[PDB]
Amino acid sequence: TTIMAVQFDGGVVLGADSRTTTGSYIANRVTDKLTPIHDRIFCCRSGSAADTQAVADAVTYQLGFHSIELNEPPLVHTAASLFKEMCYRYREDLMAGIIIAGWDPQEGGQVYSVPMGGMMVRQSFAIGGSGSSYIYGYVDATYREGMTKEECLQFTANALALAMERDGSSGGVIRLAAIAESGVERQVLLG
Amino acid sequence: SIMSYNGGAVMAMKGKNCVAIAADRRFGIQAQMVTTDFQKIFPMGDRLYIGLAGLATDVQTVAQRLKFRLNLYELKEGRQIKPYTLMSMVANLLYEKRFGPYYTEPVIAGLDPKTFKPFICSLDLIGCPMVTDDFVVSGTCAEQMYGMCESLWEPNMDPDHLFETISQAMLNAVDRDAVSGMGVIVHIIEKDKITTRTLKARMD
Amino acid sequence: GYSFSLTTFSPSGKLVQIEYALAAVAGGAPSVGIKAANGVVLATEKKQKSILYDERSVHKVEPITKHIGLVYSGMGPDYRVLVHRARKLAQQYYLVYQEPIPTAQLVQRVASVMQEYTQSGGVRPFGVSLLICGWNEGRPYLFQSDPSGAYFAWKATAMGKNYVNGKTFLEKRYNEDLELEDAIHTAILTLKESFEGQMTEDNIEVGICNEAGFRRLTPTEVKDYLAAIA
Amino acid sequence: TTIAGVVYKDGIVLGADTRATEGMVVADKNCSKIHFISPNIYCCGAGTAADTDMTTQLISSNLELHSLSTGRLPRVVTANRMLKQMLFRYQGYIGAALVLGGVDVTGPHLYSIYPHGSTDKLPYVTMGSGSLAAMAVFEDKFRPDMEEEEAKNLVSEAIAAGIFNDLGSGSNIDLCVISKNKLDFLRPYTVPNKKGTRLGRYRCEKGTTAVLTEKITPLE
Amino acid sequence: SAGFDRHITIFSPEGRLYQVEYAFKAINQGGLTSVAVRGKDCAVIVTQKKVPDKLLDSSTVTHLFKITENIGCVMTGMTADSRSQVQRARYEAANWKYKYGYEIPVDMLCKRIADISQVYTQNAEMRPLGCCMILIGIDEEQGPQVYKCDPAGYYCGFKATAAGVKQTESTSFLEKKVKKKFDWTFEQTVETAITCLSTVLSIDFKPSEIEVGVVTVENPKFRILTEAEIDAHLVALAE
Amino acid sequence: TGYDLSASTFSPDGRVFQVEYAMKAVENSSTAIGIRCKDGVVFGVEKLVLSKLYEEGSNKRLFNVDRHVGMAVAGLLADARSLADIAREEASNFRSNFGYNIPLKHLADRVAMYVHAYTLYSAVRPFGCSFMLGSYSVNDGAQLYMIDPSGVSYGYWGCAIGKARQAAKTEIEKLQMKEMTCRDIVKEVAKIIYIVHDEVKDKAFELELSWVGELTNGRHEIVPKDIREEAEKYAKESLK
């Protein structure tokens, strides 16, 4: 449910809960909610599941085919435009809370947000999910422009901690992802 | 319901070396009957019949469509058809109308073409098969025939007691039923011969 | 200078573009296939041009289902096409009837496909003759087809280079009653009659059809058996 | 209907219960809910029976076709991709609650499929109407990398609790075990519920029913 | 013979068709040479360039086309058929990746490309894409692979592989060279590729004319060598 | 000499004579060259007035495909117009689908596939055009490509299309091409075009010069050639 992406100077840092529920019963307790597309670009999803999974698979197809034909590493804004087109074309049928982030060689770390409608915007931080309203309450209080990697990790840790603590649908376990020029760093925290 | 538009009840029962299938005779609109000689059990090759219950439109339409495909199969291959093949054929024919469904519950009862092995199965309105060993039923009335056949069935049955068991079951479950009645036709078949008897049912 | 193309008959004869495809079949690599009492044996003759080629990549003996074997004598590039068509068609039969397709129905439908390509007027026929076999309902079968759409039924036959010579050996050597091993023995005999002098574990490629199912033999047992079988 | 799945130290143990109800009346006492896909991959269905049946036969046909075209053992992820693409292509109209399990070269892989197209990789799943009791037994007594008889006892215990909860089955819980080399499949595993013996004899006699019109037809 | 003037794709008498065996030397109008070698857990492509112009670039004369991240290829023959065949290969590999969820093995790709060429051959009123394609890739449980695809649709694949203009001579050297049972320790492969092209063409030239594409089971990514390490291998075989 | 009829058929020696005849169709067309510098790409076309019936500003072979890409066509003009429309359409799809400027390699490959697809079948003929494609980007530099009538598309520093294909590149290649900015290259192309065919076969010609690079900040347009007037005051000094 609750997904989060914060950029910093070197790269970006993502994060999500897992706890995919249906109604009042938890169907699955732990989920890879964030999805690799390319080796340097992620997307994290919310809303309905099958919609975002099918969209992410087709975007993975188109983006991999395009970036192999260029024989160059892809852009992040490219993947954001692809998600924008596929979200906007079937807004009558899809429910996507897709948030695009990823480091780029030309443009560094970027974070794009695509909410349930199909608009595309560049932000420095993003929320997402039904239990994101709360950390959206204080993400304009605790955030400071120009963090380090560890400050972003501690920040999103406190964020997703309180989101999992407060919302009934949110919960489960904390997954993090750190994307920079150096590498891709995933980890599983609790606290 | 739409299943209770024209009534109907089809019972098939597997015996020891033989198999017995029976159905009702009544045809009519929701409460007004018309005739007592409406056919619901059709011959599909030798020692193998099929029974159809539900809306009579889908009964005759699916019966003629199945006869079409059946004769095409038996003319493309000189041999006669195995019952599982027919079951799969009826399943494919019903599943082609997944969202345009017929309102019918076909019941297949037949023998083995090589041996004397009996066979019964039933299908649902979208093509869900179900093979059993004792009996299958279809139509509007269900719980009556379930109670009767779960009361009266034996594993090893001579054809006479088979005939009397299916007779008593059909008579009592039909006489308790309202929209399906007005006589019973019974087909009791085996390797040697084919017997068709009609019972003196209550005309009420 | 006539016939040319596929839409019009000759003044008196036959369909010259099908006769030429049959000649291209007869100019192909040899093969032999024998129907015995319990099983059917297929055997081809697969020579690499150089010493460079690998014998684990391209396969002549090819299964259609778990109990239906099939070889050819012609061109692999068309062979694979009509193989894929027969695959999809047999799986469609098994979708419809939930039962493994009988070989006569396979040969009917494959013959319908080949016949549909012999129809007018822009596509060429296949340069492929099949040898279809399988063990359906106890009695095994053997069905040869041709580019013209026709089909037959054999006890033992051959196709390729010197099929006439191999067939005159088959008429003398083979009979009605054998087992699968004696069938393989006479099959490698009649293939060794016409092949080159160096016949190894890789120059031949043999699959059988027991009633327990199709079986495509390995180079281990093929080298064990043809290590101077007679 | 209560199906379950699990991953032991080598492979996958699947279970099922075979009461195929039609409405409110038990219509079947023996319905094979464990379906064939491949020699290593199997599948279970729940909800609408014929939808699960036709879909699993189509996907098994497609994987037999692909495997015979390729020439080696299939992968589970291809089956998963075909199933999720098909069920999303039907837009969630078809209700087919699937459990997918198989052992590839990479090892055991378990997937559960919800009929809109949402899939998950899990060490243990339960699906169906009485899936909650088996999920209770799983969440109580699961540990990673169990042994064989341990996993069999756990899945049998889970489906047994599903039968002692509502809408289980009279049936003798079906099991199937897939390893890297050894496939087993066991229909009459454990019978807890014997039918009560008849107390008399409601047998009819030769002529207790009036007959109106007879016919005899000989055959060959 | 003909006679029939072989204008369309039909069968001639006794017994061949002449369109495809005219397409087999559309490779020969390329004026180009390609050699592939599989000895061990590596695989090596080598192919020279014929650039007479100083106004012409050097990066965009590359014939090694990275199909996917683990599959490379090289092309000869006419350029348009080659590049269109390459985009068909990329599109169908991406179609594999979309449909089946994992990376395509190099065998199925050659089968699919051969089938496309056969459909282009079976139906008339289309030119049969007169270019030849050699593929390489690493597969698990099979090691490395080297395959060849024909314009006719006849794929095959084998140890020491060569197609282009002068490859009767190249296969003569590769029969006279792959007959001794030594192992091929990757510099044995690079040395035998450079020297087989150096004996077929007999030029013994700068490191700036040939292109070397390698793939190895240590880094399964396809990899194109640089002028420095090409020069290193060339002087490493210089005795 | 055959067997030269269809574009699907091969020859007894293995080549398509339709493609050769279409290649030497552009040989009779006007001379068009191009060259890039270290911060831009310069076009230049020897264009001729018929006799006195033109208007000096009609039918300009310097097209303008994308915001930063234009053509320098030579050959049949209407076929080049249709191909330019196809290139505009392809850049339109890319701008609509990915939100940024098309790389010239991808554009050239799509155009080469389109030209190859018109060379393939027997219903249609191959194109009778040969054109140039230049670009510039802040993260890519200057790129100049080249498409033959067959569909072979690769890159150059300098090129020439027309009669004097060799006779331009004889003295194109003696230019110190790397160390010059394009504002020198303007009068360089002026002198190169002015060298070939002053009065010999025809009566009079006229010069156009297109212009893309860093100095236009990524734009592509024709020079204000009247501004700095760099041909004629040097063309009259290039005759001696």
Side-chain angles (χ1 to χ4, degrees), chain D residues 188-205 207-213:
Chain D
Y189 181 74
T190 298
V191 183
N193 301 115
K194 299 300 296 295
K195 178 185 176 181
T197 60
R198 315 184 57 179
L199 277 75
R201 178 172 286 109
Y202 299 153
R203 195 177 282 171
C204 295
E205 302 290 341
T208 188
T209 304
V211 179
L212 290 180
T213 297

mmCIF file of all heavy atoms in Angstrom, chain D residues 188-214, unseen atoms left out:
data_model
loop_
_atom_site.group_PDB
_atom_site.id
_atom_site.type_symbol
_atom_site.label_atom_id
_atom_site.label_comp_id
_atom_site.label_asym_id
_atom_site.label_seq_id
_atom_site.Cartn_x
_atom_site.Cartn_y
_atom_site.Cartn_z
ATOM 1 N N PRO D 188 -6.239 -42.020 -2.482
ATOM 2 C CA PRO D 188 -6.934 -42.314 -1.209
ATOM 3 C C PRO D 188 -6.005 -42.285 0.009
ATOM 4 O O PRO D 188 -5.620 -43.298 0.599
ATOM 5 C CB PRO D 188 -7.495 -43.714 -1.460
ATOM 6 C CG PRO D 188 -6.422 -44.369 -2.294
ATOM 7 C CD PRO D 188 -5.740 -43.272 -3.093
ATOM 8 N N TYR D 189 -5.643 -41.067 0.411
ATOM 9 C CA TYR D 189 -4.565 -40.884 1.380
ATOM 10 C C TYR D 189 -4.991 -41.298 2.785
ATOM 11 O O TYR D 189 -4.368 -42.169 3.402
ATOM 12 C CB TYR D 189 -4.071 -39.447 1.353
ATOM 13 C CG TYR D 189 -2.950 -39.175 2.312
ATOM 14 C CD1 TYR D 189 -1.662 -39.628 2.053
ATOM 15 C CD2 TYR D 189 -3.172 -38.435 3.461
ATOM 16 C CE1 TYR D 189 -0.634 -39.369 2.929
ATOM 17 C CE2 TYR D 189 -2.155 -38.171 4.341
ATOM 18 C CZ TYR D 189 -0.888 -38.636 4.070
ATOM 19 O OH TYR D 189 0.126 -38.366 4.956
ATOM 20 N N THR D 190 -6.038 -40.673 3.318
ATOM 21 C CA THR D 190 -6.505 -40.990 4.665
ATOM 22 C C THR D 190 -8.012 -40.805 4.730
ATOM 23 O O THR D 190 -8.501 -39.714 4.433
ATOM 24 C CB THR D 190 -5.812 -40.095 5.700
ATOM 25 O OG1 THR D 190 -4.400 -40.337 5.688
ATOM 26 C CG2 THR D 190 -6.359 -40.341 7.098
ATOM 27 N N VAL D 191 -8.732 -41.857 5.123
ATOM 28 C CA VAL D 191 -10.197 -41.869 5.170
ATOM 29 C C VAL D 191 -10.667 -41.720 6.612
ATOM 30 O O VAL D 191 -10.661 -42.711 7.356
ATOM 31 C CB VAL D 191 -10.773 -43.179 4.600
ATOM 32 C CG1 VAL D 191 -12.314 -43.144 4.582
ATOM 33 C CG2 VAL D 191 -10.190 -43.518 3.245
ATOM 34 N N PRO D 192 -11.054 -40.535 7.078
ATOM 35 C CA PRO D 192 -11.542 -40.454 8.458
ATOM 36 C C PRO D 192 -13.014 -40.825 8.595
ATOM 37 O O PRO D 192 -13.439 -41.282 9.658
ATOM 38 C CB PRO D 192 -11.288 -38.989 8.825
ATOM 39 C CG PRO D 192 -11.440 -38.268 7.532
ATOM 40 C CD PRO D 192 -10.945 -39.203 6.456
ATOM 41 N N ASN D 193 -13.798 -40.637 7.536
ATOM 42 C CA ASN D 193 -15.259 -40.701 7.608
ATOM 43 C C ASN D 193 -15.802 -41.913 6.856
ATOM 44 O O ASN D 193 -16.023 -41.865 5.646
ATOM 45 C CB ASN D 193 -15.877 -39.414 7.100
ATOM 46 C CG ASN D 193 -15.424 -38.214 7.892
ATOM 47 O OD1 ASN D 193 -14.755 -37.325 7.370
ATOM 48 N ND2 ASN D 193 -15.774 -38.188 9.174
ATOM 49 N N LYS D 194 -16.005 -43.005 7.581
ATOM 50 C CA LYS D 194 -16.675 -44.171 7.028
ATOM 51 C C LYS D 194 -18.185 -43.956 6.996
ATOM 52 O O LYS D 194 -18.765 -43.378 7.920
ATOM 53 C CB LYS D 194 -16.321 -45.434 7.810
ATOM 54 C CG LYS D 194 -14.836 -45.755 7.770
ATOM 55 C CD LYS D 194 -14.365 -45.977 6.333
ATOM 56 C CE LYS D 194 -15.011 -47.188 5.676
ATOM 57 N NZ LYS D 194 -14.629 -48.457 6.340
ATOM 58 N N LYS D 195 -18.813 -44.408 5.909
ATOM 59 C CA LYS D 195 -20.268 -44.401 5.816
ATOM 60 C C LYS D 195 -20.887 -45.408 6.778
ATOM 61 O O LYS D 195 -20.396 -46.534 6.915
ATOM 62 C CB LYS D 195 -20.703 -44.749 4.391
ATOM 63 C CG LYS D 195 -22.215 -44.818 4.191
ATOM 64 C CD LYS D 195 -22.590 -45.284 2.796
ATOM 65 C CE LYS D 195 -24.100 -45.422 2.667
ATOM 66 N NZ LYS D 195 -24.495 -45.904 1.319
ATOM 67 N N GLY D 196 -21.936 -44.969 7.471
ATOM 68 C CA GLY D 196 -22.679 -45.862 8.343
ATOM 69 C C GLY D 196 -23.315 -47.020 7.593
ATOM 70 O O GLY D 196 -23.859 -46.862 6.498
ATOM 71 N N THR D 197 -23.192 -48.204 8.182
ATOM 72 C CA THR D 197 -23.769 -49.429 7.644
ATOM 73 C C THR D 197 -25.290 -49.374 7.636
ATOM 74 O O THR D 197 -25.909 -48.775 8.525
ATOM 75 C CB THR D 197 -23.311 -50.632 8.456
ATOM 76 O OG1 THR D 197 -23.736 -50.477 9.815
ATOM 77 C CG2 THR D 197 -21.799 -50.751 8.417
ATOM 78 N N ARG D 198 -25.886 -49.969 6.606
ATOM 79 C CA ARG D 198 -27.342 -50.042 6.507
ATOM 80 C C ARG D 198 -27.910 -50.854 7.663
ATOM 81 O O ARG D 198 -27.271 -51.787 8.161
ATOM 82 C CB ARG D 198 -27.737 -50.750 5.215
ATOM 83 C CG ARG D 198 -26.998 -50.337 3.966
ATOM 84 C CD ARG D 198 -27.594 -51.073 2.778
ATOM 85 N NE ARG D 198 -29.023 -50.844 2.622
ATOM 86 C CZ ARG D 198 -29.751 -51.362 1.641
ATOM 87 N NH1 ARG D 198 -29.188 -52.157 0.743
ATOM 88 N NH2 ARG D 198 -31.047 -51.103 1.569
ATOM 89 N N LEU D 199 -29.103 -50.491 8.109
ATOM 90 C CA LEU D 199 -29.654 -51.201 9.255
ATOM 91 C C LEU D 199 -30.697 -52.219 8.839
ATOM 92 O O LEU D 199 -30.867 -53.242 9.510
ATOM 93 C CB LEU D 199 -30.301 -50.229 10.243
ATOM 94 C CG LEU D 199 -29.448 -49.498 11.273
ATOM 95 C CD1 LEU D 199 -28.614 -48.363 10.689
ATOM 96 C CD2 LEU D 199 -30.371 -48.997 12.358
ATOM 97 N N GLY D 200 -31.390 -51.943 7.741
ATOM 98 C CA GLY D 200 -32.142 -52.901 6.968
ATOM 99 C C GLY D 200 -31.832 -52.727 5.495
ATOM 100 O O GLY D 200 -30.692 -52.497 5.084
ATOM 101 N N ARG D 201 -32.901 -52.826 4.706
ATOM 102 C CA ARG D 201 -32.926 -53.498 3.412
ATOM 103 C C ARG D 201 -34.143 -52.954 2.666
ATOM 104 O O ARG D 201 -35.270 -53.434 2.869
ATOM 105 C CB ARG D 201 -32.970 -55.019 3.517
ATOM 106 C CG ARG D 201 -33.046 -55.679 2.144
ATOM 107 C CD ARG D 201 -32.903 -57.182 2.192
ATOM 108 N NE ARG D 201 -31.526 -57.583 2.453
ATOM 109 C CZ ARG D 201 -31.099 -58.126 3.587
ATOM 110 N NH1 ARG D 201 -31.949 -58.354 4.579
ATOM 111 N NH2 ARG D 201 -29.822 -58.456 3.720
ATOM 112 N N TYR D 202 -33.946 -51.923 1.852
ATOM 113 C CA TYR D 202 -35.075 -51.256 1.203
ATOM 114 C C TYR D 202 -35.099 -51.651 -0.263
ATOM 115 O O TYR D 202 -35.251 -50.856 -1.190
ATOM 116 C CB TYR D 202 -34.976 -49.743 1.380
ATOM 117 C CG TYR D 202 -34.999 -49.263 2.821
ATOM 118 C CD1 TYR D 202 -34.390 -48.067 3.187
ATOM 119 C CD2 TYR D 202 -35.602 -50.021 3.819
ATOM 120 C CE1 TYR D 202 -34.398 -47.635 4.501
ATOM 121 C CE2 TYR D 202 -35.612 -49.601 5.129
ATOM 122 C CZ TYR D 202 -35.011 -48.411 5.467
ATOM 123 O OH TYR D 202 -35.033 -48.010 6.784
ATOM 124 N N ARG D 203 -34.958 -52.961 -0.425
ATOM 125 C CA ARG D 203 -34.785 -53.613 -1.710
ATOM 126 C C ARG D 203 -36.149 -53.876 -2.332
ATOM 127 O O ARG D 203 -37.069 -54.347 -1.655
ATOM 128 C CB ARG D 203 -34.013 -54.916 -1.515
ATOM 129 C CG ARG D 203 -33.438 -55.552 -2.760
ATOM 130 C CD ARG D 203 -32.647 -56.807 -2.370
ATOM 131 N NE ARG D 203 -31.328 -56.479 -1.823
ATOM 132 C CZ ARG D 203 -30.509 -57.353 -1.243
ATOM 133 N NH1 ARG D 203 -30.864 -58.626 -1.119
ATOM 134 N NH2 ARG D 203 -29.338 -56.951 -0.774
ATOM 135 N N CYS D 204 -36.289 -53.574 -3.613
ATOM 136 C CA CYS D 204 -37.578 -53.782 -4.248
ATOM 137 C C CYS D 204 -37.690 -55.198 -4.783
ATOM 138 O O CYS D 204 -36.716 -55.954 -4.812
ATOM 139 C CB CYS D 204 -37.786 -52.791 -5.388
ATOM 140 S SG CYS D 204 -37.882 -51.083 -4.847
ATOM 141 N N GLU D 205 -38.890 -55.535 -5.236
ATOM 142 C CA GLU D 205 -39.187 -56.879 -5.696
ATOM 143 C C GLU D 205 -39.491 -56.882 -7.189
ATOM 144 O O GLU D 205 -39.734 -55.845 -7.807
ATOM 145 C CB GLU D 205 -40.365 -57.450 -4.904
ATOM 146 C CG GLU D 205 -40.133 -57.503 -3.395
ATOM 147 C CD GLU D 205 -39.101 -58.533 -2.963
ATOM 148 O OE1 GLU D 205 -38.792 -59.460 -3.740
ATOM 149 O OE2 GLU D 205 -38.595 -58.412 -1.828
ATOM 150 N N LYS D 206 -39.508 -58.086 -7.758
ATOM 151 C CA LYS D 206 -39.668 -58.280 -9.199
ATOM 152 C C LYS D 206 -41.134 -58.123 -9.597
ATOM 153 O O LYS D 206 -41.859 -59.094 -9.827
ATOM 154 C CB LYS D 206 -39.122 -59.639 -9.616
ATOM 155 N N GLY D 207 -41.575 -56.873 -9.701
ATOM 156 C CA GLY D 207 -42.950 -56.620 -10.087
ATOM 157 C C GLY D 207 -43.736 -55.640 -9.240
ATOM 158 O O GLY D 207 -44.958 -55.531 -9.390
ATOM 159 N N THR D 208 -43.062 -54.909 -8.355
ATOM 160 C CA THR D 208 -43.742 -54.001 -7.440
ATOM 161 C C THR D 208 -44.146 -52.689 -8.106
ATOM 162 O O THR D 208 -44.666 -51.799 -7.425
ATOM 163 C CB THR D 208 -42.859 -53.710 -6.224
ATOM 164 O OG1 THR D 208 -43.607 -52.963 -5.259
ATOM 165 C CG2 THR D 208 -41.628 -52.914 -6.638
ATOM 166 N N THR D 209 -43.938 -52.564 -9.416
ATOM 167 C CA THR D 209 -44.208 -51.348 -10.166
ATOM 168 C C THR D 209 -44.978 -51.677 -11.435
ATOM 169 O O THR D 209 -44.566 -52.551 -12.206
ATOM 170 C CB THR D 209 -42.897 -50.641 -10.524
ATOM 171 O OG1 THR D 209 -42.152 -50.377 -9.330
ATOM 172 C CG2 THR D 209 -43.162 -49.341 -11.265
ATOM 173 N N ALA D 210 -46.093 -50.978 -11.640
ATOM 174 C CA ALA D 210 -46.955 -51.238 -12.784
ATOM 175 C C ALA D 210 -46.287 -50.759 -14.065
ATOM 176 O O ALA D 210 -45.765 -49.641 -14.128
ATOM 177 C CB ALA D 210 -48.305 -50.549 -12.597
ATOM 178 N N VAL D 211 -46.311 -51.605 -15.089
ATOM 179 C CA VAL D 211 -45.640 -51.348 -16.357
ATOM 180 C C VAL D 211 -46.711 -51.220 -17.429
ATOM 181 O O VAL D 211 -47.628 -52.046 -17.500
ATOM 182 C CB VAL D 211 -44.640 -52.468 -16.691
ATOM 183 C CG1 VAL D 211 -43.958 -52.201 -18.017
ATOM 184 C CG2 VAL D 211 -43.615 -52.614 -15.572
ATOM 185 N N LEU D 212 -46.603 -50.187 -18.261
ATOM 186 C CA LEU D 212 -47.612 -49.933 -19.278
ATOM 187 C C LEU D 212 -47.240 -50.440 -20.663
ATOM 188 O O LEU D 212 -48.093 -51.000 -21.355
ATOM 189 C CB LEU D 212 -47.901 -48.436 -19.376
ATOM 190 C CG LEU D 212 -48.635 -47.794 -18.208
ATOM 191 C CD1 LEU D 212 -48.816 -46.316 -18.499
ATOM 192 C CD2 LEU D 212 -49.966 -48.477 -17.963
ATOM 193 N N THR D 213 -45.989 -50.277 -21.082
ATOM 194 C CA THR D 213 -45.600 -50.600 -22.452
ATOM 195 C C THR D 213 -44.144 -51.030 -22.472
ATOM 196 O O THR D 213 -43.267 -50.246 -22.107
ATOM 197 C CB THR D 213 -45.802 -49.401 -23.382
ATOM 198 O OG1 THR D 213 -47.193 -49.058 -23.449
ATOM 199 C CG2 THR D 213 -45.289 -49.716 -24.778
ATOM 200 N N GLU D 214 -43.891 -52.259 -22.906
ATOM 201 C CA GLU D 214 -42.547 -52.809 -22.956
ATOM 202 C C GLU D 214 -41.993 -52.741 -24.375
ATOM 203 O O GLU D 214 -42.726 -52.554 -25.348
ATOM 204 C CB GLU D 214 -42.535 -54.254 -22.458
#
